[PDB]
């Protein structure tokens, strides 16, 4: 008997049902209460200024035409009937190429209750557009939005809500971090209005707050560039008669900074300005450049070719431009690290 | 009413032929267009294209969809666009494009009571524009978007920008990473092909490349390596192991700049303005090491048969000629 009643309920719901028109097209607005469960805040692409997110995207609204009376109170539907029932045209305002999964069946469920309330969830993969301000790279933090709303229906036709308190609506899974470069600090849920050429739409908004971990860039970029500058200052404690040695020591630290400037440059999208790591490399390239101009000034005032033999004619003296540069250049690089790591670990 | 609205719409699409143009034997239909650009995603110099996300909207008057009694603009489902006549407009620059289909296919049909119809589309197109990169990276680029009717000629369909010059919006909100939009323009004209004369609309930008990226990476170390090649002029000629190890390591550093920028800059195989500066700086590094062997051959090879004069001469000429080379370079490409 139950297999006969259930098929006759699903036949009489679609009699006279026009899915082309909104529930209450001239009567009232359609309050669509939305709800998001984030299962993986996927990998954020810095060079594309985008990120990926896997959601169970829930929707709930009331349709008067789908009331029924039967044995059960809630129905479950195959998606052939979910394509015959009206569905709000939610799109993502910053989506780039998002995927509605259908393995192995289309991952959608539509549930009718006896009073007409529809529950419509889907499993999505949304590739959204996150604008980034990389002036403080890598010691920066930016909020990636996930903004959605109706496509054709204005504020006078379809209004979106949340199914509960807005901070409790967007839920992130505890094991669903799935980030390796950033650190998901928490989300913020809000709601807004666009002024399009067609009309005013209701926009739900979720911002995900990300702070970049800088432990990779210290070992790969900062510490070899610090230790190369420490090298090019250590040639000051060599004797002034080491004319091949302090030349060989000087230019090879420049080629080492040239090697480190290339590999640090590849791990960055091509912004139009100086990132915070680029302020560090260009100044560290200047301490290595100026350490060889120091030896070009010492060599101009040497006046001899031989050095101090260990058993003792007249000899050279340790120059004033060497004894000053032993004090000046480690200090001006030490003062620069105090200015750099306090300006950018404050912002 | 709500049940009356179904009976109104069902008799609009009863007997409606989607194969026929509106006024199929009469006047040409006038389609007015409207683009709300969401974002210009990336501008690639290798593939010679740019990605464009936009809200592409079209308005035309259809007498077969005139409904009376209902004082509201019927905004229907997106699936009724498969049961109407929509224009067959395309893009000539279009390499690859798609209408967004999450959560549904992002279309709209907003009927009006006089017969006016809006058909919006959120399209992410990859439009192709060729670039004159002979002034890279000090260049301006003009990338277009051509909009044309495919089958219908200018006797069947007619295009116009709806709103005049305020048709395309959202260009001032675009903040490209390494470019800067100077001015966008709107062009309406008719183009004759081998089949007929078709109407064409053109949206076209003017991209100016920002230069702060390439000074820190490409120009400034290539300058400071040439200056370190001049250090072998204030060193005595007897320092053979010192004056060689400057200029030999200096031609190696210019090699590792040029070869690793070839792997870092976009690969476009012809001669650019950055290639002539890096080859131009490589010569001053190459000539400064020729200066020592010209000194080393005179004192020792043609010695037992002036030496300080050539080192004194090169301290003035090579900083002057390289500053003269920058004056030729930074005035020709600016």
């Amino acid at each position, epitope marked *: 008997d139950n297999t006969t009643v259930f098929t006759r309920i699903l036949d009489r719901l679609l009699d006279g049902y026009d899915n082309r028109l909104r529930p209450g097209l001239g009567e009232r607005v359609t309050e669509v209460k939305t709800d998001i469960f984030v299962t993986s805040f996927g990998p954020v692409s810095d060079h594309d200024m985008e990120y990926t997110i896997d959601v169970f995207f829930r929707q709930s609204w009331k349709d008067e035409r789908l009331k029924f009376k039967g044995p059960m109170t809630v129905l479950r539907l195959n998606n052939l009937m979910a394509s015959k029932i009206w569905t709000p045209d939610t799109f993502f305002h910053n989506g780039k190429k998002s995927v509605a999964h259908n393995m192995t069946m289309p991952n959608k469920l539509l549930r009718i209750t006896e009073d007409g309330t529809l529950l419509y969830t889907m499993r999505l993969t949304v590739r959204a557009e996150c604008p980034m*301000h990389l002036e403080d790279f890598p010691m920066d933090a930016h*909020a990636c939005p996930l903004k959605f709303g109706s496509y054709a229906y204005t504020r006078a036709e379809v209004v979106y809500e949340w199914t509960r308190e807005p901070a409790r609506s967007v839920v992130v899974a505890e094991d669903g971090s799935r980030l390796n470069q950033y650190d998901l600090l*928490g989300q913020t849920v809000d709601s807004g*209005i666009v002024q399009s050429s067609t009309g005013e739409y209701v926009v739900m*908004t979720t*911002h995900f707050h990300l702070k970049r971990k800088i432990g990779y860039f210290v070992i790969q970029t900062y510490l070899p560039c610090i230790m190369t500058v420490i090298l090019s200052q250590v040639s000051f404690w060599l004797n002034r008669e080491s004319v091949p040695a302090r030349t060989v020591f000087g230019v090879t630290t420049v080629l080492t900074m040239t090697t480190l400037s290339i590999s640090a440059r590849n791990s960055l999208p091509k912004v139009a300005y100086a990132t915070a790591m680029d302020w560090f490399i260009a100044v560290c390239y200047a301490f290595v450049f100026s350490a060889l101009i120091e030896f070009a000034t010492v060599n101009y005032f040497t006046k001899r070719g031989y050095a101090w033999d260990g058993k003792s004619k007249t000899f050279n003296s340790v120059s004033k431009i060497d004894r000053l540069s032993r004090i000046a250049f480690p200090l001006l690089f030490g003062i620069f690290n105090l200015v750099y790591w306090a300006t950018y670990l404050n912002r | 009413n709500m049940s009356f609205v179904k009976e109104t719409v069902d008799k609009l699409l009863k007997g409606y032929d989607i194969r026929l143009r509106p006024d199929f034997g009469g006047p040409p239909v006038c389609v007015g267009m409207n683009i709300d650009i969401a974002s210009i995603d990336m501008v690639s110099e290798v593939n010679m294209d740019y990605t464009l996300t936009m809200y592409f909207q079209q308005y035309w008057r259809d007498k077969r969809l005139a409904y009376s009694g209902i004082p509201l603009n019927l905004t229907l489902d997106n699936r009724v666009a498969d049961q109407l006549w929509v224009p067959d407009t395309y893009f000539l620059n279009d390499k690859k494009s798609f209408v967004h289909g999450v959560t549904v296919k992002n279309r709209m049909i907003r009927l009006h009571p006089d017969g006016t119809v809006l058909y919006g589309l959120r399209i992410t197109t990859t439009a192709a524009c060729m670039m004159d990169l002979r002034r890279y990276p000090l260049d301006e680029q003009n990338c277009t978007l051509e909009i044309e009717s495919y089958g219908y000629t200018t006797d069947d369909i007619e295009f116009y920008w709806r709103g005049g010059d305020k048709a395309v919006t959202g260009v001032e*909100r675009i903040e490209l990473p390494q470019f800067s939009i100077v001015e966008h323009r709107l062009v309406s004209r008719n183009v004759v092909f081998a089949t007929g004369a078709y109407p064409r609309l053109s949206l076209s930008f003017r991209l100016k490349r920002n230069i702060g990226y390439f000074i820190l990476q490409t120009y400034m170390p290539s300058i400071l390596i040439t200056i370190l090649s001049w250090v072998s002029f204030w060193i005595n000629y007897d320092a053979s192991a010192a004056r060689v190890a400057l200029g030999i390591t200096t031609v190696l550093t210019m090699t590792t700049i040029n070869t690793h920028l070839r792997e870092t800059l976009p690969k476009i195989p012809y001669v650019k303005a950055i290639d002539m500066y890096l080859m131009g700086c490589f010569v001053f590094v190459f000539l400064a090491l020729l200066e020592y062997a010209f000194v080393n051959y005179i004192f020792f090879g043609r010695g037992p048969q002036d030496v300080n004069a050539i080192d004194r001469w090169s301290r003035i000429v090579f900083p002057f000629t390289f500053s003269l080379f920058n004056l030729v370079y930074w005035l020709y490409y600016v």
Partner: nanobody
Framework: GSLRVSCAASGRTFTTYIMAWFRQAPGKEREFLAAMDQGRIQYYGDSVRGRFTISRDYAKNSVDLQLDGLRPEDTAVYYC?????????????????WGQGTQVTVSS
């Protein structure tokens, strides 16, 4: 009566940034009023929703605020904020650029 408080920026293109409007009565409480994002998305505080109208101009690098339906409770100093909202869009600690102040006085 209506009013239109504007905010002309300088020195930096704030198209990417969120340009907001705050409010501080005597009592030291920075209150959110409105904020428009880069994609022309109008956020509003629930006390001034439906009354104030924010409207950025992106070619001139400015943010406006169409004050309408004013009351003597709206008599305060209106700060023009700008910056990317990190833990933001309702919080003053996310806005790193600030306006001077505009004493809007309403007397019934």
């Amino acid at each position: 009566g209506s009013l239109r408080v504007s905010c002309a920026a300088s020195g930096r293109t704030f198209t990417t940034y969120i340009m907001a409007w705050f409010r501080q009565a005597p009592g030291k409480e920075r209150e959110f009023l409105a904020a428009m994002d880069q994609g022309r998305i109008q956020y509003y505080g629930d006390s001034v929703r439906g009354r104030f109208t924010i409207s950025r101009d992106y070619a001139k690098n400015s943010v406006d605020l169409q004050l309408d339906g004013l009351r003597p409770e709206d008599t305060a100093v209106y700060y023009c904020a700008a910056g990317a909202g990190f833990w933001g869009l309702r919080t003053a600690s996310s806005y790193h650029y600030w306006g001077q102040g505009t004493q809007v006085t309403v007397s019934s």
